[PDB]
Amino acid sequence: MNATLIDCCDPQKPSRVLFHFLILDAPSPSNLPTYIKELQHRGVRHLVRVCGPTYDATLVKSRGIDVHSWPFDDGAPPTRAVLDSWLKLLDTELARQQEDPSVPPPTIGVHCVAGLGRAPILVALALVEYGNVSALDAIALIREKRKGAINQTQMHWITKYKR
């Protein structure tokens, strides 16, 4: 498994990880049980799919992983609805940790198909919003681990973003 781990760190204490992001490939229906096991084995709390369904999410939900189906168009930046839902989820996970010192940093998975566009740009945005990393540095960081990630339109949108 074919996954890229990107840490989003506390701006104040860059020692401290806020979230672990996993950029993943989409599962095939036939390999779905193995795939779920591999998510569980990496402590995945939340799975976000930003592509059109290619499988039955209920099988994942039943194994303790929250699944979020927020499709947006290939080559596109997140819609405002997806973005707000993403920040809402991350805000909630952030409050969960602050409220309870017994909660370690959550791993949050994100897949589409290629992992070159839609998945990475959500992660990039999290780095900008919570890690306080500049847009250009978030892109470079993702590209280190995933060559060819993020098209020109996605690049422009993340360079322009504020809450």
UniProtKB/Swiss-Prot annotation:
Residues 13-163 form the Tyrosine-protein phosphatase domain. It is found in: Cytoplasm; Mitochondrion matrix, Kinetoplast; Secreted, Extracellular exosome; Secreted. Pfam families: PTP-SAK. GO terms for biological process: dephosphorylation. SUPFAM superfamilies: (Phosphotyrosine protein) phosphatases II (SSF52799). The keyword Lyase does not apply. The active site is at D74, C112. GO terms for molecular function: phosphatase activity; protein tyrosine phosphatase activity. Substrate binds at A114, G115, L116, G117, R118. Disulfide bonds join C51-C112. InterPro entries: Prot-tyrosine_phosphatase-like (IPR029021), PTP (IPR050561), PTP-SAK (IPR057023), Tyr_Pase_cat (IPR003595), Tyr_Pase_dom (IPR000387), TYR_PHOSPHATASE_DUAL_dom (IPR020422). Its EC number is 3.1.3.48. Belongs to the protein-tyrosine phosphatase family. Has protein tyrosine phosphatase activity and may act as a virulence factor to support intracellular survival in host macrophages. This is Protein tyrosine phosphatase PRL-1. It comes from Leishmania major. The gene is PRL-1.
